[PDB]
């Protein structure tokens, strides 16, 4: 993974899933899983953007 | 018809350019702190290829 | 993922699934999962639109 993009996506997913509606452990876990899936998608984004460029 | 094809070739010869640069950027939309990596390409021999704000 | 398209799709899925019929945590979770699937589809949309262009 890329680290800083993972940190920004983790922060953004903790902002979208607002923590008032969430237990903290499940919030951090769901944000981490969604950020890992976002990294797996962003790899293919990098490949497609290189091809389009 | 040979004269017209020669005129067509000479008209094509003017738009054949050399030495053109090209910028590219994924994520034209951006947040406050998101990177949005700009990538430039200069076909010059030697250059500095900076980015100016 | 692309961030701003994810934010707009998250907002639109929270408008479609109206929050009067939804508990807030499950609403945000289903909107986030649908927005991630929409990003995974929009990657292939970008590839197909580049090919069609």
A48 vs A44: CA distance, rounded Å: 6
Give the Cα separation of A43 and A50 in Å (integer): 11
User: What does the buried/exposed string (b/e) look like for B8-43 if buried means 16 or more CB atoms within 10 Å of the residue's CB?
Assistant: eeeeeeeeeeeeeeeeeebbeeeeeeeeeeeeeeee
CA-closest candidate to residue B26, choices A42, A41, A12, C9 = A42
Give B39's strand partners: B24
Burial C14-38 (b: 16+ CB within 10 A, else e): beebeeeeeeebebbbebbebbbeb
Long-range contacts of B40-46 (CB under 8 A, 24+ apart): B43/B19, B44/B19
| Resolution of the entry in angstroms | 3.6
Query: Using the beta-carbon criterion (under 8 Å), do B34 and C5 form an inter-chain contact?
Result: no
Measured over the CA atoms of residue C49, residue B51, residue B34 and residue C13, the dihedral's sign is negative
Ordered DSSP codes for A14-25: HHHS-GGGS-HH
Which of B27, B35, B36 to mutate: most C Cβ within 10 Å?
B27
Structure-solving method: cryo-EM
- Which chain C residues are closer than 8 Å to A17 by Cβ? 25, 28-29, 32
């Amino acid at each position: 993974m890329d680290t800083t993009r993972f940190i920004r996506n983790f922060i953004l997913f903790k902002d979208a899933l607002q923590k008032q509606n969430f237990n903290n452990k499940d919030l951090n876990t769901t944000s981490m899983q969604a950020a890992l899936q976002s990294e797996q998608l962003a790899l293919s984004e990098e490949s497609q953007y290189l091809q389009s460029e | 018809i040979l004269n017209s094809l020669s005129k067509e070739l000479e008209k094509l010869n003017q738009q054949s350019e050399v030495n053109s640069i090209q910028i590219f950027s994924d994520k034209l939309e951006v947040l406050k702190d998101a990177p949005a990596r700009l990538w430039g390409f200069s076909t010059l021999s030697n250059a500095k290829e900076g980015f100016y704000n």
